[PDB]
Amino acid sequence: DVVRVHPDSSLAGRKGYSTTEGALYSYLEGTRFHQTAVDMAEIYTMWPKQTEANEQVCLYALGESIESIRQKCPVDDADASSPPKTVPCLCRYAMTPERVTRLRMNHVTSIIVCSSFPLPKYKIEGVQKVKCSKVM
Amino acid sequence: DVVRVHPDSSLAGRKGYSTTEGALYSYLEGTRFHQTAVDMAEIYTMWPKQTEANEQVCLYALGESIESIRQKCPVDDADASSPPKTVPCLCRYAMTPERVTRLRMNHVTSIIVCSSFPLPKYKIEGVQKVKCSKVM
Amino acid sequence: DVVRVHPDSSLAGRKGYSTTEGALYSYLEGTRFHQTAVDMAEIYTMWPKQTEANEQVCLYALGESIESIRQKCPVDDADASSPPKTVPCLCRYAMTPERVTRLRMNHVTSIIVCSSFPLPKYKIEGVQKVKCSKVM
Amino acid sequence: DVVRVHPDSSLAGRKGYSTTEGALYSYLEGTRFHQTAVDMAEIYTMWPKQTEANEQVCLYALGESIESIRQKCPVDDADASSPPKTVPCLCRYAMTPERVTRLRMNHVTSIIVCSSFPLPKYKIEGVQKVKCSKVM
Amino acid sequence: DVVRVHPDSSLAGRKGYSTTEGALYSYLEGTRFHQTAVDMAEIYTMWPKQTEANEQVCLYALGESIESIRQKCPVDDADASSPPKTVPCLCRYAMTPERVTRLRMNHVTSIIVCSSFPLPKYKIEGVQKVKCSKVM
Ligand SMILES: [Zn+2]
Ligand SMILES: [Zn+2]
Ligand SMILES: [Zn+2]
Ligand SMILES: [Zn+2]
Ligand SMILES: [Zn+2]
C-alpha cells in the first residue's frame, strides 16, 4: 500500500509514496520523519481536542522538547497513538511530520501556519496564522 | 464515577472528567493538580472557617510555600482533609486546584478572585475581589 | 453572552461585543481595558455613594494612580467589586473603561464629563462638566 | 478458603484471592507481602490502641526498620499477632500490607493516608491525611 | 474542658476553645502562643504588683527579650507561674498571649492598650493607653 504525501514532500516520486493517491495517515516508517511523526501522534493523544493538540504541535515545531510536552499533559493517561495526517492540507504551510522535522532541523524561531491547522484563538509566540490557499 | 470539572478546565473532555455532571469534590488523582488539591484540602482543615482558609489559599496561589502555611496555623491539631471543590463556581476566576496550580506555575504577583470565594473584609496583598459572574 | 459596548467603542463589531444588545456590565475580560475596568470597579466599592466615586474615577482618568486612590479611602473595608457599566450613556463623553483607558494612555490634563456621570457640585481640577447629549 | 484482597491489589484475579469475597484478615502467606504483613501484625500487638499502632505502621511505611519499632514499645510483653486487615478500606490509600510493601520498596519520603486509617491528631512527618472516598 | 478565648482570637471556633464559656486562665498548650503565655505568666510572678508586671508585659510585647525581663527582676526568687488570663477583657486591645505573640511577630514599635490592662501612671515608651470599650 502506498502512502500519500504532500506535493512538496521530499518523499514525492519515491517507492511506496505518491502525491495523488495512497494512505492519508502514516507514521512514515523507513524515514527520519518517522520519529517526528510518532511524537506528533503522541501529542494528538495527550490533548484530545485538536486546537490545543495543534498548539502543542506548533510548540514542538518551534524546538520545544517532546519531554516537556509530556509533562505539560494534565493527566497521566496513555493511550495508543493514531498515525498523523500526511496531507492535512495541500498548501505550502501543511503541518506534516516532514515540515515539522524540517522546522526543528532549521531551529526556526517563527512559523507560518495555515487555517487547516486549527489553533487557539489567542496568540501563540512564534506562530503566525494565515489563510489556507487550498485544502484537502 | 466521573469527576465534574470546570468548563475551562484542561481536564474537560477527558476520560473520568466531565463538565455537566460528576463529583463536585475530588483530590484530582492522576493529575498534577492532585498535589495542589491535597494541599488546599489541608489548608481547609487548618482553618475551619472558610474566610481565613480562603485567605490562606489565596496566599498559597501567590507562591507562598505550604510549609509556612502549616506554620501559621494556631494549633497543631491535624484532622483528615476533605477533598476540595472541583467547581467552586462557573466563572473564569474559580479557585479550583487546577487554577491554583496554574497560578503557582506562572508565579503571578497578583490574582483576581470572584465573590464565590469568600475572603476577609480587609485588604489582602496581591488579591483583587470581583463579583462572580455566574455561580454553581 | 454578548457584552454591550458603546457605539464609539473600539470593541464595536467584534466577536462577543455589540452596540444594540448585550450585557450592560462587564470587566471587559480579554481586552486591555479589563485592567482599567476592574480598577474602576474597586473604586465604586471604596466610595459607596456615586458622586464621590465618580470624582475618584475622574481623578483616575487624569493619571492619578490606583494605589493613591486606595489610600484615600476612609476605611479599610474591602468588599467584592461589581462590574462597571460598559454603556453608562450614549454620548461621546461616556466614562466607560475604554474611555478611561484612552484618557490615561493619552495622559490628558483635562477631561470633559457629561451629566450622566454625576459629580460633586464643587469644582474638580481638570474636569469640565457638560450636558449629556443622549442617555441610556 | 479465599482471601479477600483490594481491587487495586496485585493479587486480584489470582488463585486463592478475590475482590468481592474472602477472608478479610490474612498474613498473606505465599506472597512477599507476607513478611510486611506479619511485621504490621506485630506492630498491632505492640501498641494495643489503633491510633498509635497506625502511627507506627505509617513510620514503618516510611522505611523505618521493624527493629526500631520493637525498641519503641514501652513494654517487653509479646503476645501472638492477629492477621492484619487485607482490605481496611476500598480507596486507593488503603494501608494494606501490599501497599506498605510497595511504599517501602519505593522508599517514599511522604505518604497519603485516608481517614479509615485513624492516626494521632498531631502531625506526623511524611504523612498526609485525606478523607476516605469509600469504606468497607 | 474547653478554654475560653477572645472573640477575635484565632482559636475561636476550634476544638477545645470557645468564646462564650470555658476556662478563663490557660497556658494555651498545643498552640504557639503557649510559649508567649508561659513567658507572660513568669513575668506575673516576677512582679507581684499588677501595674509593673503589666509594664514588663508591654515591654515584652514591644520586642524586648524575656531574658532581659528576668534580669530586671529585683529579686532572684522563682515561684510557680499561674496561667495568664485568656480573656482579660472583651475589646480589640485585650493583652492576651495571642495578641502579644502577634505584636512580637509584627515587631511593632508602638502598641495600644485598654484600661483593663492597668499600667503605671507615668508614660511608657511605645504604649498608648485608651479606655476599654467593653470589659469582662
Ligand atoms: Zn493549508
Ligand atoms: Zn466565581
Ligand atoms: Zn453622557
Ligand atoms: Zn480509605
Ligand atoms: Zn479592654
Side-chain angles (χ1 to χ4, degrees):
Chain A
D1 287 332
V2 181
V3 168
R4 184 176 179 179
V5 293
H6 200 258
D8 294 356
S9 180
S10 64
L11 306 165
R14 303 212 176 218
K15 182 67 180 294
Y17 297 100
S18 170
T19 297
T20 61
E21 73 272 15
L24 292 162
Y25 305 76
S26 170
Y27 299 97
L28 300 178
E29 69 275 16
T31 71
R32 274 79 63 194
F33 319 121
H34 178 70
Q35 183 62 255
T36 289
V38 299
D39 284 339
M40 280 165 73
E42 183 178 1
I43 290 173
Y44 287 125
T45 78
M46 273 199 274
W47 281 272
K49 65 179 73 175
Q50 202 67 11
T51 288
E52 293 179 353
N54 287 350
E55 189 209 324
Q56 295 313 311
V57 167
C58 281
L59 290 174
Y60 182 58
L62 301 162
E64 183 178 1
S65 178
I66 192 64
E67 293 179 350
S68 56
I69 301 298
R70 288 204 174 79
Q71 287 70 241
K72 286 195 280 194
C73 180
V75 288
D76 290 331
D77 187 10
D79 54 352
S81 70
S82 181
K85 294 181 176 67
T86 58
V87 190
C89 63
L90 277 296
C91 65
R92 61 182 291 160
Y93 317 96
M95 284 292 289
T96 75
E98 194 181 309
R99 165 145 196 254
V100 176
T101 304
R102 186 185 74 251
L103 297 164
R104 290 176 63 83
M105 274 170 31
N106 292 320
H107 302 287
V108 297
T109 56
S110 67
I111 62 172
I112 294 174
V113 161
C114 79
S115 64
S116 283
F117 199 57
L119 287 174
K121 290 178 178 178
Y122 52 91
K123 65 177 181 180
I124 301 167
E125 184 66 27
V127 176
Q128 196 168 5
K129 296 183 290 294
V130 302
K131 187 269 183 181
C132 181
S133 60
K134 85 198 298 303
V135 304
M136 186 66 204
Chain B
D1 288 333
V2 65
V3 167
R4 164 138 187 191
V5 291
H6 198 256
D8 305 342
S9 181
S10 62
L11 306 166
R14 304 212 175 219
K15 187 269 183 182
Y17 306 100
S18 179
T19 297
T20 61
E21 71 270 14
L24 286 188
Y25 304 77
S26 174
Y27 301 96
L28 297 180
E29 293 83 3
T31 70
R32 67 179 62 87
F33 323 121
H34 176 72
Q35 183 62 255
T36 293
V38 301
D39 288 348
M40 284 159 69
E42 183 178 1
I43 290 172
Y44 288 125
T45 56
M46 289 192 259
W47 284 273
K49 65 179 73 174
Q50 195 54 357
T51 300
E52 46 194 80
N54 288 352
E55 178 208 21
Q56 297 313 309
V57 166
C58 283
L59 284 184
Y60 185 57
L62 297 179
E64 183 178 1
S65 179
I66 188 64
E67 293 178 350
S68 56
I69 303 298
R70 292 180 179 91
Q71 282 150 45
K72 286 193 279 193
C73 181
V75 287
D76 290 331
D77 186 9
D79 53 351
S81 69
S82 180
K85 292 177 71 68
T86 60
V87 189
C89 65
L90 294 174
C91 65
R92 183 177 292 171
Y93 316 106
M95 281 294 252
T96 70
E98 183 178 1
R99 163 144 194 254
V100 176
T101 304
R102 165 161 83 270
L103 295 163
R104 289 177 62 85
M105 294 299 291
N106 301 0
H107 303 288
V108 298
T109 58
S110 67
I111 60 171
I112 294 172
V113 173
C114 77
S115 65
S116 283
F117 200 57
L119 287 173
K121 289 179 177 179
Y122 50 90
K123 195 79 189 94
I124 300 168
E125 182 66 26
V127 174
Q128 194 148 29
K129 304 173 186 179
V130 304
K131 159 167 166 315
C132 181
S133 60
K134 68 189 298 294
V135 304
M136 186 66 204
Chain C
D1 287 332
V2 167
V3 167
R4 165 139 187 195
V5 293
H6 198 255
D8 292 337
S9 180
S10 63
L11 306 165
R14 304 214 174 221
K15 181 266 290 180
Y17 306 97
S18 159
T19 295
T20 45
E21 72 271 14
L24 314 175
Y25 306 78
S26 170
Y27 298 96
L28 299 182
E29 313 77 356
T31 69
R32 65 182 186 271
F33 320 121
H34 178 72
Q35 183 51 18
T36 288
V38 300
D39 287 8
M40 290 165 69
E42 183 178 1
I43 290 173
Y44 287 125
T45 53
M46 286 184 271
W47 283 272
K49 65 179 73 175
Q50 183 62 255
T51 187
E52 65 183 1
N54 287 350
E55 187 209 327
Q56 297 313 311
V57 166
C58 282
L59 297 179
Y60 187 57
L62 290 186
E64 183 174 359
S65 178
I66 191 65
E67 291 178 349
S68 57
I69 295 169
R70 292 180 179 91
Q71 287 70 241
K72 294 144 68 153
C73 180
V75 288
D76 288 330
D77 186 9
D79 53 352
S81 68
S82 182
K85 279 187 197 257
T86 61
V87 189
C89 63
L90 277 296
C91 65
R92 36 169 308 151
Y93 312 108
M95 284 295 288
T96 73
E98 191 188 316
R99 164 143 195 254
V100 177
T101 304
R102 186 177 56 251
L103 296 164
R104 290 177 62 84
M105 293 177 70
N106 300 359
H107 303 289
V108 298
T109 57
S110 67
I111 63 172
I112 295 172
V113 170
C114 78
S115 63
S116 283
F117 200 57
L119 287 173
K121 300 289 94 175
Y122 44 88
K123 64 178 180 180
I124 300 168
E125 183 65 29
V127 172
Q128 192 150 6
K129 295 198 271 303
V130 303
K131 182 174 72 68
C132 180
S133 59
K134 67 189 297 293
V135 304
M136 186 66 204
Chain D
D1 287 333
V2 177
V3 166
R4 166 141 189 193
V5 293
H6 198 256
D8 297 327
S9 180
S10 63
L11 303 166
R14 303 213 174 220
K15 184 178 184 293
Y17 305 99
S18 178
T19 298
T20 43
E21 72 270 14
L24 300 148
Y25 305 76
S26 171
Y27 300 98
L28 298 193
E29 69 275 16
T31 68
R32 62 187 65 190
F33 321 122
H34 178 72
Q35 183 62 255
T36 291
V38 301
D39 291 15
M40 302 162 54
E42 183 178 1
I43 289 173
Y44 288 129
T45 54
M46 290 191 247
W47 284 273
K49 65 179 73 175
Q50 210 51 30
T51 300
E52 293 179 353
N54 288 352
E55 169 207 71
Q56 297 314 310
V57 166
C58 283
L59 286 177
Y60 179 82
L62 306 175
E64 184 173 359
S65 177
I66 193 66
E67 291 178 350
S68 55
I69 303 297
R70 284 209 200 61
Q71 295 298 109
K72 285 192 278 194
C73 182
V75 288
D76 288 331
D77 186 9
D79 186 286
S81 69
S82 180
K85 292 177 71 68
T86 61
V87 189
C89 63
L90 277 296
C91 65
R92 64 201 272 141
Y93 310 109
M95 278 303 249
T96 70
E98 165 165 354
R99 163 143 195 253
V100 174
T101 302
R102 186 176 66 249
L103 297 163
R104 290 178 63 85
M105 293 177 71
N106 298 12
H107 302 289
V108 300
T109 57
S110 67
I111 62 171
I112 292 173
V113 298
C114 74
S115 64
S116 284
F117 200 57
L119 287 177
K121 298 293 183 182
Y122 49 91
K123 64 178 181 180
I124 299 169
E125 182 66 28
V127 176
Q128 184 177 2
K129 296 183 290 294
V130 304
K131 188 180 78 69
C132 182
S133 58
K134 68 189 299 294
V135 304
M136 185 64 73
Chain E
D1 288 331
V2 62
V3 166
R4 193 181 165 153
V5 294
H6 197 253
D8 309 330
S9 181
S10 63
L11 307 169
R14 303 213 174 219
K15 182 68 180 294
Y17 306 101
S18 177
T19 298
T20 61
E21 72 270 14
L24 288 176
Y25 307 77
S26 170
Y27 302 96
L28 291 181
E29 298 74 356
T31 69
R32 65 181 183 270
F33 314 114
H34 176 72
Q35 176 62 40
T36 293
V38 298
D39 288 341
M40 280 163 64
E42 199 200 20
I43 289 174
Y44 285 129
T45 50
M46 282 180 269
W47 284 274
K49 306 163 174 189
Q50 194 64 21
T51 54
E52 65 183 1
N54 286 350
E55 183 178 1
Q56 297 315 311
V57 164
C58 282
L59 289 174
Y60 182 68
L62 306 172
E64 166 161 342
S65 179
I66 189 65
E67 291 178 350
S68 57
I69 298 297
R70 288 187 180 94
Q71 294 296 321
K72 302 158 46 143
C73 179
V75 291
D76 63 358
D77 185 9
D79 184 38
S81 67
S82 181
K85 292 181 181 179
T86 61
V87 188
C89 65
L90 289 185
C91 65
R92 64 193 272 141
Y93 301 105
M95 294 299 291
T96 71
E98 173 170 345
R99 164 141 193 256
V100 176
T101 305
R102 188 174 67 247
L103 296 166
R104 292 177 63 85
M105 292 180 183
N106 289 319
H107 302 291
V108 296
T109 58
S110 177
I111 62 170
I112 294 171
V113 297
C114 74
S115 64
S116 284
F117 202 59
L119 289 176
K121 299 289 94 176
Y122 50 89
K123 204 54 181 63
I124 298 169
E125 182 65 28
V127 174
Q128 207 161 351
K129 315 184 207 181
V130 304
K131 171 180 170 117
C132 183
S133 66
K134 68 192 298 292
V135 308
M136 186 66 204

